[PDB]
Symmetry: D2
Subunit: 314 residues, 4 copies
């Protein structure tokens, strides 16, 4: 791991495998190790992914292994966990996933691992916080997927809408990855021009075309799930994106799950805010000056997370 | 300005992975997904579009129907019949021929005339069939052939001899399947034939190169044995072929090609090194097969043509 | 024309050649034709550029030609012109370059050309305006390099200074390519956080560090010219960047020279403002809401350009 | 995490273009520029940094002195003696040996322990010299050799026979200059030897591809007639060699390599296909030269050794 990057992936279901396929198709990592007690499916996938390695932009070494093989990984990405049953509450789900994560994080730490954790399993902000507690690592080195997917979709939708490149559009979705996440309209700007100005100086641009764009961003997963049974291509891409910012030391600003410590008036909680991501993990936290409405929405969002953490952590 | 468009027929494991590979690689400008099961196709398009903002190149992906093929540069067929694990029907090829008959008809009816790319098995048979059912020139119906197997082979050897695959020549030709064969006579690392390296060294034993071939030929069976299906590797090969087409690469690939007595066989689609570009097959490179290989090849071409007439 | 991009370059000196080398190294165009009456130097460069085409990321066809060879070009890039002699005024330089451009533009129009003009020669805003008048093309299809290079250097300094990726930093330099160009501080933001906030809520972030970053951006060319004798690598890169936004239809926002009639209170002048650039040229003009100071700086900048145009145009 | 670093010695036409090519291609992480003419090097670093925001990859470029070579992975030498119009002096090799002597001792004295990449002419001679003055392992001193000329060749041949250069083997070996020679015996397209294509057709004939070789050998002289110097092509070849090193490619390239009787030559640096990776030269491809090529090659190696002895 001096001239080569390695990723250990824990959990080879739909998300995990699509994530692996993405890393390979994009040439993001040099080595990938897949860890999953379901050995036949996971070795099947590893073998399938090696089958076509000749066509990838860069050669990727893919293997089946276990926790000991994490020793030299730069990143461990956890996609393992039970899935939210209908009629089950999130606290009931969290109780199951905390037990699973306790074993995983424990074993990874004992292998000698000294990299970054990247958490994908739901509820992600909760499990990111737990991985921090269980691991003993600095909070900068435990990262969750946060609202990254929703943000990027929000930012692209708008980019199509006002007609600039995404690189030029500023739009963040922040808060808990879920229903209480909020748009930061007060700071949304096309090519530097605040959205509110673009709207008022125009009736080709109207708020409802915008307030529904938000409602569609928040329901995207539910509609995918309704038509196909599950969602995983989007999540895979968002994880590949985060992995790339880390392995290639990009200092990209992404709304990953980040530990807050007083900023935005929130304490002792992992939550989606814009943060600079590099080879060391979290390099810095962007502190947007929220307007009064957003500040209340956000503290509420941080609140629903603390309500879930409180029964499980002191 | 030309906008590259692909239409995909069949959003199963192979079709879906193929799509995801195009999106991750930035290979096409537009992609349309068509499936008899409309809800799966709709759902898949939504999932693929969910992470659209993370794709390296913008790609317009949409749900479509047969008429949306009209202006497609390429139509990729990944649809096919399910196994009935009972009726092993060494045929059942009949099931698929009927599917392809109906499918090809609908796309021709839409006004399409770009290129077909066939992935379903048995790929050589169904490629021949697609040509027949479509009435397009032979250079514009293409099957995945043995491209995957040749590519494993070639790379698996750049490891063995220690060069970039870029510098290591090696093909696998014949029917995609059991009767396929390596072209040892033209295998060379750097500008240096394999047999030369075999004798003039024993870090390069001559049985170690032999076993590598068995790996390549059985790789798919082993994946199927564990997971139930292969898709990631296939999807990669398809995306590669699509890339040589859409970007006019003129790159040499052992795709399923129509033969005109060129390897002592004709009236058959079969795996052979063909040059691939925007017009489709642009040439067939003709290897000087040694006698062992001519035997293997014509036996392989025979096996295929055999299963053919009964339906043509 | 339909499956391939072509660039015609007029003028094969330091800028033009470096630009060509840049297009080739970056794989931006499929075809390049070089046009210059200095036949030996220009065929020399074409031959030199072709000598190593095998190592370029993409195969690129380079040739020596003349105006007739512009018929099927997507872009014509003009780098030809006299160079500003010591003790010569800009109005004296413009008199020379207007005569030269009159011949060049006339000849390329008569060849059948129907693409975009990209103008590099100094004074760039003046010659971009002239090329518009001489060509009869829509104003969206005549583009100058503008403050594009200074802007991007400005937006890289700050990127290294506040520690985020460039794609996350917003900072424009606008106005005349030259001494009256101004920073738009009022809209400079990191991750969406105005620079003025960042200065206050910290003092690892003082003002002068900022004002000097500007003074150094304005003088960069002069210092290169002191030590090296001439400047051309940066200019070439900025041109390749603009060319890429056009040939690949990016909708990138770039401070190219753009025709204003009314925007920012300026009429009938080409000047550097942020504009969306795509395959059709200028797609839209970002209208920043300048503060009192900036608005005055900008109209002064538009003013020194009109002072130069007025003797030459109605 | 390792940061790739390149030190460049000589910011003239070739050095400057090499730098701009590294920046445009995103090949290294850091680059230092060293020149006796301090002002020129400062100015160039400044010009190269001017457009830094536009580089595809971040690259730290700095002005430097010989001590800055300590951490350098690669040291590239593009410095050399001026023509002198006066005495044509088939020597002046003397002028340049004195330059390299001083340059190499200065870098070694910094703690440098990476790879040398030599570009100045006559490249083969100066590569030999650099290996002497440095005392490094021979696998860590590399000359540009005939990489450029082979790559042109390989390319003109992908046009002529109509394939992607990726599958069109053809080398040019020997001294970089007049006595260099094409290896027709292993020239092949898609697996098929050139001679097979020449006789088996008249769309292809052995005077067509006889002149392709003369164009290749004389290209540089023609550029020099017109413009005074070549740099763009050379800079491209250097950046390519630098890329195979820094990115551990195991690319086969006809760089200047030290020979151990390997082609009947010994104690000489000369152009042959060698595998290039992060450790430098990792192997030497042993082509089975026909008798004509053996003659040319050993004659080529003779010419070189002969220029060497008076300085041995
Ligand atoms: N390794 C393998 O993936 C495997 C193994 C043996 C055979 N095959 C053959 O290859 C085909 C593709 O493999 P897969 O794993 O993606 O199968 P799959 O079952 O996952 O998907 C096949 C898709 O084709 C679609 N389809 C069927 N008839 C259609 C029609 N007439 N028009 C449009 N779409 C139609 C189905 O809806 C399905 O989505 C299989 O159907 C099978 O015939 C595949
Ligand atoms: N086609 C060609 O470019 C060409 C033609 C004939 C000979 N050459 C040889 O190759 C060399 C490089 O080619 P070029 O075209 O860039 O020449 P160039 O004159 O443009 O650059 C040579 C650079 O080397 C520098 N230099 C000289 N001695 C040095 C030393 N002791 N330490 C550090 N730097 C030193 C010079 O200051 C100069 O900047 C030439 O000097 C010449 O010997 C090149």
């Amino acid at each position: 791991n001096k001239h080569v990057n390695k990723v250990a992936l824990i959990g080879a279901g739909f998300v995990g495998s699509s994530y692996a396929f993405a890393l390979i198709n994009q040439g993001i990592t040099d080595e990938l190790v897949v860890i999953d007690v379901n050995k036949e499916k996971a070795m099947g996938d590893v073998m399938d992914l090696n089958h076509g390695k000749a066509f990838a932009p860069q050669p990727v070494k893919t293997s089946y292994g276990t926790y000991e093989d994490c020793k030299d990984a730069d990143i461990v990405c956890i996609c393992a966990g039970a899935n939210q049953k209908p009629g089950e509450t999130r606290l009931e789900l969290v109780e199951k996933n905390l037990k699973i994560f306790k074993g995983i994080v424990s074993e990874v730490m004992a292998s000698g691992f000294d990299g970054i954790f990247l958490v994908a399993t739901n509820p992600v902000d909760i499990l990111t916080y737990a991985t921090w507690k269980f691991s003993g690592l600095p909070k900068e080195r435990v990262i969750g997927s946060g609202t990254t997917l929703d943000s990027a979709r929000f930012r692209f939708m708008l980019s199509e809408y006002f007609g600039a490149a995404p690189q030029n559009v500023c739009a963040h979705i922040i808060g808990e990855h879920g229903d209480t996440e909020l748009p930061v309209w007060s700071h949304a700007n096309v090519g530097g021009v605040p959205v509110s100005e673009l709207v008022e100086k125009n009736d080709a641009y109207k708020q409802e075309e915008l307030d529904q764009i938000v409602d569609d961003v928040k329901n995207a997963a539910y509609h995918i799930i309704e038509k196909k049974g599950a969602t995983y291509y989007g999540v895979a891409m968002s994880l590949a994106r985060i992995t790339k910012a880390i392995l290639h030391n990009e200092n990209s600003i992404l709304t990953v799950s980040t530990y807050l410590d007083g900023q935005y008036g929130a304490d002792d909680v992992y939550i989606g805010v814009p943060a600079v991501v590099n080879r060391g993990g979290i390099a810095g936290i962007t502190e947007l000056n929220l307007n009064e409405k957003e500040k209340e929405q956000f503290l509420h969002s941080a609140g629903v997370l603390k309500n879930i953490l409180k029964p499980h952590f002191a």
